[PDB]
Write a protein that binds this ligand. Structure first.
Ligand SMILES: Nc1nc2c(ncn2[C@@H]2O[C@H](COP(=O)(O)OP(=O)(O)O)[C@@H](O)[C@H]2O)c(=O)[nH]1
Ligand SMILES: [Mn+2]
Length: 346
């Protein structure tokens, strides 16, 4: 009956860890920000939209950037497209001449070499103090979204700002709590704002990691700057429609590469090290504890004891309730990401 022991031990560990971490997040959450947004801070801003074959959405994406209240003499746009088959370059060119007061630079590249490479080239042609990366399928809900993020970058210790997303609460809590404590290791591509000096020390975006926003936020936090996601900087998450599950596992893959590579570079500031280690644990270790328990009880069930069959029937019965479904499928995504990662490289 020792596989029931190991099963309920592993289940207690797997579900115990995130809830203790959530409780420590909620005590950080009730401590006030040690940095302040400044509404008169007005630096030069470069918004970069990297695009590969997104001719449908990029006209309306440009219209969405165009409609920000942010003052236009301090705003410029670089649409970086590295050899798209669709007519995206002269779609942006067409729009570019329909909206002339908005400074636009379409830089085009020999050859597609991935998102980070495109971003790196766009960086050298950018003139702003703040660089905002945003995905072409991302739309900013308000006309002061951009200004809200910028207001949060005024403090010299804040190196990077990203948004809180809406369409779980637990996920958001971890974000803003880690932000208040020091930094959050997960940023969002819907809006990722960096100080150009910092990108330029790092320097630029490196090709090796999938989650460029989160990896850059994490290395800026490693340097002693704040990487934060304030609750009033909110974007809408762009859900893909096709291949929802493949899309979510590929995001999980980016997160697992990022956390695996991040923990292997020691020396985190004392405020960050518990955040970094907890998030890396939840992303690299805890998922495995789940299906190991499930297999322990499956073997215990098919042969022998079958209180284990009651435990798996209760597991399915708890798939009734939708937060359990969300959590278990996120763990599933993470496990698939780990194996897809290991066999992807060869
Ligand atoms: N220039 C360039 N842009 C890219 C490339 N790959 C992705 N992008 C852009 O990166 C943004 C996000 O890509 P997406 O496929 O939606 O990734 P996902 O949202 O995580 O599924 C989009 O605006 C794309 O246009 C690339 O190889 N070159
Ligand atoms: Mn997308």
């Amino acid at each position: 009956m020792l596989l029931e022991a190991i099963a309920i031990a592993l289940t207690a560990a797997h579900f115990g860890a995130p809830l203790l971490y959530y409780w420590r997040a909620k005590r950080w959450l009730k401590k006030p920000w040690d940095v302040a947004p400044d509404p008169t801070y007005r630096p030069r801003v470069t918004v970069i939209v990297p695009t590969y074959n997104e001719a449908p959405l990029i006209e309306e994406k440009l219209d969405n950037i165009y409609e920000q209240d942010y003052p236009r003499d301090k705003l410029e746009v670089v649409v970086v497209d590295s050899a798209s088959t669709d007519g995206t370059p002269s779609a942006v060119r067409r729009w570019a001449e329909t909206h002339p007061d908005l400074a636009l630079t379409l830089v085009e590249e020999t050859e597609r070499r991935g998102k980070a490479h495109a971003l790196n080239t766009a960086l050298r042609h950018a003139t702003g103090e703040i660089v905002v990366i945003t995905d072409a399928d991302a739309l900013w809900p308000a006309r002061d979204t951009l200004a809200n993020a910028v207001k949060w970058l005024a403090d010299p210790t804040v190196g990077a700002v990203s948004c809180v997303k809406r369409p779980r609460d637990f996920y958001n809590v971890l974000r803003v709590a880690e932000s208040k404590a020091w930094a959050t290791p997960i940023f969002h591509g819907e809006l990722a704002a960096f100080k150009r000096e910092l990108l330029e020390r790092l320097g630029g975006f490196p090709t090796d990691v999938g989650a460029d926003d989160s990896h850059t936020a994490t290395k800026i936090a490693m340097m002693g700057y704040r990487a934060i996601t304030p609750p009033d900087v909110v974007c809408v998450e762009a859900v893909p429609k096709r291949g929802y599950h493949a899309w979510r596992i590929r995001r999980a893959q980016h997160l697992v590469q990022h956390f695996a590579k991040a923990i292997r570079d020691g020396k985190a500031p004392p405020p960050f090290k518990p955040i970094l280690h907890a998030e890396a644990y939840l992303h690299l270790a805890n998922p495995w504890a789940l299906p190991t328990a499930a297999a322990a009880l499956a073997a215990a069930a098919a042969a022998g004891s079958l209180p284990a069959a009651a435990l798996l029937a209760t597991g399915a019965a708890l798939a009734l309730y939708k937060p359990y479904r969300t959590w278990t499928t996120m763990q599933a995504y993470l496990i698939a990401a780990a194996v897809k990662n290991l066999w992807d490289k060869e």
